[PDB]
Design a protein around this ligand. Structure first.
Ligand code: HEM
Ligand code: HEM
Ligand SMILES: O[C@H](C1=C(C2CCCC2)S[C@@H]2CNCN12)C1CCCCC1
Ligand SMILES: O[C@H](C1=C(C2CCCC2)S[C@@H]2CNCN12)C1CCCCC1
Lengths: 386, 373
């Protein structure tokens, strides 16, 4: 598909398998690997027992006692993705410890070298990203039952009662519900090129319907996450080392790079499905010199390369918004607005979630709300009719 | 062959072919100011002429070439207005009569409202004789800032190197088709031709010494090409009166905005934008300052399989040697350019550009580390 895009121009008449978008789970990693080869048992033991090793003060010693394991026995993408999740969770636990302020600024070579090597191979930074902790950190309990919260579990957690299962899985379920609108993207671009007004209108309504369905999926957050544990426990382990006063220069990846490196912590700003619909609908979240725009643009380098490629390819295609704005067609404008309105409804509900889980507990924050309010505002201002 | 939707010309590559030299008569007030910047600046009459302008509508710029020329005109006027005589007395508000059509035209071309490489280098040129080839002797720039500023030498030598490197672009489809069809001999020959084009571009670079002098470049030209992003002289940015309420920050024109140099780093798997470092962040940010079709071309190149990974996986010395000849040619360009920056920035600053050298040395080292052997 890439070869033909060079010759015929950027036209997304189909979703090429090279973008690694699954029909069922979208940007999520389909059926993630749960076990590494026996050679990596020492990594797996630490990753699977982070809550106990952290609480007992034995984690840093277990990490320091590791031998440097070669990454050559991780032969496929899924084992490399699991290894990235394993090493990333271990790195977070090692750096932050019990989460009370005693930090480690040097990641031992026995973990830092295979971590950075594997990160270079997957073109991802050596820090836990949304693609690790949400997109690859899951399993079905029963392979014969559908993708529901009851039939799912996470592979790794940080502390007991940290609500990592609820937080990661509800993000994953919303991510998967929104992904059902991705298969409609080629229909939208083909309808525009072939000037098929009724096909375009029906496609825009189907995308709006998928995004509306994703809002219902979001409601489950309240049943599986509690504000105290999320704010005081989970939030500490998901911090990065970029502009972080606790690690002002970054982290030393011993044996791999000489100087400490700064990397931003895992963020849902790294979700490709939400950036995908903002690009598709011409909600220029990444335009201008604003902080919100710069953050979302920077988060693309923290997405898997095929997903980052998908986003810039969406950007290279003609504008759906410009097409709809030029047609003097109420029905088409209304269908476009139903997609934008569904995104505004998701972001408005999400702002209420952030008030419950971050704002109120912090008072017993405002920079996070201002970012979210800017993204939401840019979305609301994209509506053709109020 | 590469799609016409990418707007890569067969002869001048990413440069704008035969740029428009005159705007419609309606825009005579803009053109008079832009064509007389050296005199209006020196005499202290420029800011008054800009303040005396009526707000002209951009609707009479009907094609891409007239919109590109208008962007060059407004951008040069904006730089002269902001920096004045280049002695430190700055303007922090761009008057609405220029700021509004500038921002509107910039939104239309999907470019920020500041002079970019695509304005001042890619569209700021003409042939003296249309029947003679693209040589320095047969070329001139459309706009300069001050007399003796060496803008002709600096802009044209950049343009000539940009055009020489562009001859390797037509080989890109051959490289990707050869990889997909598993045509080893075709791929080897393609890599050797790209190395040959990059070697030729180094010779073109040597001309800089004949047309630019360190004193005038450092003390005069450098001042007019500054932007307002992290600039202590305009710490909050520039007010684009009538268009945005708050001041906005935009980086100044940079060769980090050249699409042809970013293209060969993407093609050869030199991950200049990877790693979280400042150099990577800068080159990534500069893509939003390129014309959208050229930014789309870079995305498309990035979406194709890695040439480096393909060559590394074949256990083929001849193919590795051809790939290494491309990387070596890029290292040689960057090493020569570092010596130029020592002559034109480092030494004049001492009679201080160390951050600029560190950025260039990071880019060069990332290129050197891509050699297979
Ligand atoms: C406990 C509940 C949640 C909290 C406290 C929360 C918090 C946040 C915060 C603080 C940000 C700002 C960026 C950052 O700091 O990294 C953010 C962004 C975002 N969140 Fe959540 N979130 C929650 C649930 C979810 C769920 C279930 C999803 C669905 C996948 C989601 C999707 C997003 C997206 C896509 C963004 C990027 C900004 C936007 O596109 O509007 N969040 N979230
Ligand atoms: C008077 C001579 C020159 C000086 C002093 C000079 C200076 C600089 C400086 C300071 C930078 C860093 C970026 C910035 O600050 O905007 C830079 C980058 C760059 N320059 Fe030049 N330059 C000269 C001639 C050229 C020429 C003739 C070309 C050819 C098109 C060129 C191509 C580049 C490229 C492609 C970059 C980006 C970094 C890289 O890819 O290695 N320069 N230059
Ligand atoms: O943006 C971070 C986050 C995710 C992280 C979990 C681990 C990797 C991705 S999932 C989620 C859904 N909404 C926001 N998302 C943010 C970090 C700071 C605390 C609040 C959460
Ligand atoms: O990076 C700037 C620059 C260019 C400018 C000219 C006008 C718009 C793009 S051309 C050139 C070639 N090499 C470096 N390039 C900037 C120029 C002023 C001095 C500091 C460096």
């Amino acid at each position: 598909a890439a070869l033909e895009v060079l010759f015929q121009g950027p036209h997304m008449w189909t979703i090429s398998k090279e973008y690694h978008i699954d029909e069922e789970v979208g940007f999520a990693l389909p059926n993630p690997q749960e076990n590494l080869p026996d050679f990596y048992n020492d990594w797996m033991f630490i990753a699977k027992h982070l809550p106990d090793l952290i609480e007992s003060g034995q984690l840093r010693e277990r990490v320091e006692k590791l031998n440097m394991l070669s990454i050559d026995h991780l032969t496929d993408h899924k084992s490399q993705r699991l290894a990235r999740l394993v090493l990333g969770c271990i790195t977070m636990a090692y750096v932050w410890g019990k989460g009370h302020g005693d930090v480690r600024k040097v990641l031992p070579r026995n973990i830092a070298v295979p971590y950075c090597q594997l990160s270079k191979k997957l073109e991802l930074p050596p820090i836990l990203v949304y693609a690790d902790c949400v997109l690859a950190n899951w399993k079905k309990k029963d392979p014969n039952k559908p993708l529901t919260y009851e039939n799912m579990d996470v592979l790794f957690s940080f502390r007991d009662g940290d609500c990592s299962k609820g937080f990661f899985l509800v993000s994953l379920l919303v991510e998967i519900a929104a992904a059902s609108a991705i298969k409609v993207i080629p229909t939208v671009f083909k309808a525009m090129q072939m000037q098929e007004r009724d096909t375009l209108l029906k496609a825009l309504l189907e995308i709006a319907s998928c995004l509306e369905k994703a809002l219902q999926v979001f409601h489950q957050i309240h049943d599986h996450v509690n504000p105290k544990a999320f704010f005081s426990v989970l939030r500490i382990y998901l911090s990065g080392w970029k502009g972080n006063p606790q690690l002002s220069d970054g982290l030393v990846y011993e044996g791999f790079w000489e100087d400490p490196k700064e990397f931003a912590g895992g963020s849902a700003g790294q979700s490709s499905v939400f950036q995908c619909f903002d690009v598709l609908l011409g909600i220029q979240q990444t335009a201008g010199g604003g902080h919100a725009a710069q953050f979302l643009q920077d988060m693309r380098r923290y997405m898997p390369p095929a997903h980052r490629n998908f986003l810039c390819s969406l950007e290279s295609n003609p504008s759906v918004r410009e097409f709809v704005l030029s047609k003097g067609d109420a029905g088409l404008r209304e269908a476009y607005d139903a997609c934008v309105k569904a995104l505004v409804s998701l972001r408005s509900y999400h702002l209420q979630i952030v008030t419950k889980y971050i704002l109120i507990p912090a008072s017993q924050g405002t920079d996070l709300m201002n970012f979210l309010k800017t993204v939401r505002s840019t979305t609301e201002k994209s509506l053709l009719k109020e």
